Amino acid sequence: MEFYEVIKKRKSIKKFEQTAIDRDKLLKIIDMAMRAPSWKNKTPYKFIVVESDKLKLDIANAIENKTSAASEAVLNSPMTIVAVANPEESGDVSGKEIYLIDTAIAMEHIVLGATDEGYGTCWIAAFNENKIKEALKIPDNLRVVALTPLGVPKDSPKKDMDEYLYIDKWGTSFMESNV
Amino acid sequence: MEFYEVIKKRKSIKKFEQTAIDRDKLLKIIDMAMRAPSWKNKTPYKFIVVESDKLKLDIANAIENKTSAASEAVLNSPMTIVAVANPEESGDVSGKEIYLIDTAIAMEHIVLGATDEGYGTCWIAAFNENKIKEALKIPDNLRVVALTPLGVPKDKKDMDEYLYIDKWGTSFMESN
Prior knowledge:
Oligomer: homodimer
Strand order of the largest sheet of chain A: 5-2-1-6
Family (chain A): Belongs to the nitroreductase family.
Number of strands of chain A: 6
Largest interface: A-B, 45 and 45 residues
EC number (chain A): 1.-.-.-
Pfam families (chain A): Nitroreductase
CATH class of chain A: Alpha Beta
Largest sheet of chain A: 4 strands, mixed
Protein name (chain A): Nitroreductase family protein
CATH superfamily of chain A: NADH Oxidase
Distance between the termini of chain A: 28 Å
Number of helices of chain A: 7
Number of domains of chain A: 1
CATH architecture of chain A: 3-Layer(aba) Sandwich
Strand content of chain A: 15-25%
InterPro entries (chain A): Nitroreductase, Nitroreductase-like
Helix content of chain A: 25-40%
């Protein structure tokens, strides 16, 4: 798609087909995140691709929204992408947590790239973070910044991405696994 | 330009031509920011377009980088875009300052939009925030999140309420 058309088409999607994500399209979305700007070109975040239904259920239960729409989007999509950061990598710059800025930038590349590849997303930032860390086996010194479902909507210094992309569990390589 | 091509083409630019920014392209870039997602669709930020050379010099002097490259990018481009946020509008969600997340999202829409439109940018986050608030007459309870030069490299919200010229509160649109 054309760039401005991607910006215009992006919306928060809560209803998804069960259609499987194309692996090549997913890896292009992650590549778009890998190409995001960051402070001092440090990359204080990694992404966990969550495909296990049991883990979706854990994430759904952890979400703290007024309505169940976000929880259901996670239940009812083929996968969820979770953005996890290390606050100590770059620390604070002029009174601001750099990790929040840099991880937000990269996650918007995920979101816009999904839209470009014909997939819906929905920013989710409100959750019991401890519960998500327990589900995904994330060390407690890291921060869960945001997550999003990924699916087809219902009609209604070159980084090696392999170091930055996990499947279901923190530390388990997406690209090296029989996923 | 194709979406993926903009992503790949984006780079930090430090050297610029003097060429004036096209107004219509600038407003298209801000529009792209207006369409950014945010928590509860609140918009805790606004943008100051800085065109005054005196103010560019104030900003250049406020930047706190090891090298002078960023300072010079602000001096030698036709304008700089400054993102200013209100922490108290949405506050914190799950131990995180929503304003930083949301402002960063929208600033990346201006960075990418700039690239789409043929202009370079450079994220600048390290500065004497007080000096920039002084220069741009920003109330002290707000935060300067980031800024970027905008220029040609060498070699349903109404954006009117979210876009200022040179000084906080002075409408870009409604000004000559």
